Design a protein that fits this description.
This is part of a larger assembly, with two copies of chain A. The two termini of chain A are 38 Å apart. An eight-stranded mixed beta sheet of chain A has the order 1-4-15-6-11-12-13-2, with no helix packed on it. In chain A, strands 5-14-7-8-9-10 form a six-stranded antiparallel beta sheet, with no helix packed on it. In chain A, strands 3-16-17 form a three-stranded antiparallel beta sheet, with helices on one face. Chain A has 238 residues and is mainly β. Chain A has a single domain, classed as Spike glycoprotein, N-terminal domain (Jelly Rolls), CATH 2.60.120. Chain B: This is Spike protein S1. Chain B: It comes from Severe acute respiratory syndrome coronavirus 2 (2019-nCoV).
Chain lengths: 238, 99
């Protein structure tokens, strides 16, 4: 339950429209800069969902579970990456009191299915994800980058590319992680998204390189209201 | 609903061959406009569908059945002016097509 600074992580492509050499300001659910993310360690509790989540880790992790009531009474999302074939279902699964994998065992009693989807998954490296349920769609963003530190997150900048958009339209209010259990510990972080406004910086290729949070401090508010990453001497009304 | 995602549920109308370097009126998944289509050096990432310009103007697109980028540029337009020395002197004129 330790706390770690989120720094400048959790920026994703918001609109899926090509741009180049221009700054664009948009409003969406972004992870605030220099926030506090809960650091876990081994145990598998259940956590809320709120408006989204930011997931990071450093092949022990074996999928996630999203739902609202569980116990086969209400629909629950399923994501698992086994045998290089990720399979997604929304069937009525009854969940054990302490779900762990180690064939599969967590996802037994598959019945009353409504949705089905299969694709090919892709592989000192961090794996970051953003899960968001908006207007009846389940959107996922991800990126894999090499790292050289385990104590805390890197302080660089990196943007997340869209991966999957599923038309499910299921209400979600709770979720938990799933990791393979055999008889080395694993560590992962959890953040939360809030409706903040950002100013994005684009490159010649169209890759996001810089971004400023308009509600972090007065200087960033001045930058956002001036639509520039540099400001000259003077006094400005914000 | 519309205008929320790339189009997936279309009508039964047929397609037509693609032409280049000619002011034509195109139709790309319901996107209507006029202009000339030329090859471009913009390196679209695999997930985007089209580019965009200010004042809500489409600048570049990729086409169905070929996955090739195509530029768009409006065909020429401008003003016109008439040079005259006066009806009291002559009846001859000159014409200037601006820019």
């Amino acid at each position: 339950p330790a706390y770690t600074n989120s720094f400048t992580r959790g920026v994703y492509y918001p609109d899926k429209v090509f741009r180049s050499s221009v700054l664009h300001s948009t409003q969406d659910l972004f992870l605030p800069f220099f926030s506090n993310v809960t650091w876990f360690h081994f145990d598998n509790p259940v956590l809320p969902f709120n408006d989204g989540v930011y997931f990071a880790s450093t092949n022990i992790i074996r999928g996630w579970i999203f739902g609202t009531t569980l116990d086969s009474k209400t629909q629950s999302l399923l994501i698992v990456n086994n045998a290089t074939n990720v399979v997604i279902k929304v069937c009525e699964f009854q969940f054990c009191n302490d779900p762990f994998l180690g064939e599969f065992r967590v996802y037994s009693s598959a019945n009353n299915c409504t949705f089905e989807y299969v694709s090919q998954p892709f592989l000192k490296n961090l794996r970051e994800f953003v899960f968001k349920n908006i207007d009846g769609y389940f959107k996922i963003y991800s990126k894999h980058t090499p790292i050289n530190l385990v104590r805390d997150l890197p302080q660089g900048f990196s943007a997340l590319e869209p991966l999957v958009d599923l038309p499910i339209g299921i209400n979600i209010t709770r979720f938990q992680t799933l990791l393979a259990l055999h008889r080395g510990a694993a560590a992962y972080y959890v953040g939360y998204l809030q409706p903040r406004t950002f100013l994005l910086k684009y490159n010649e290729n169209g890759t996001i390189t810089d971004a400023v949070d308009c509600a972090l401090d007065p200087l960033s508010e001045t930058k956002c209201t001036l639509k520039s990453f540099t400001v000259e001497k003077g006094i400005y009304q914000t | 609903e519309l205008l929320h995602a790339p189009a997936t549920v279309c009508g039964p109308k047929k397609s037509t061959n693609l032409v280049k370097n000619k002011c034509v009126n195109f139709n790309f998944n319901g996107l209507t406009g006029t202009g000339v289509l030329t090859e471009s050096n913009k390196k679209f990432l695999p997930f985007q569908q089209f580019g965009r310009d200010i004042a809500d103007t489409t600048d570049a697109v990729r086409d169905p059945q070929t996955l090739e980028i195509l530029d768009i540029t409006p065909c020429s337009f401008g003003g016109v002016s008439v040079i005259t020395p006066g009806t009291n002197t002559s009846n001859q004129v000159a014409v200037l097509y601006q820019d």
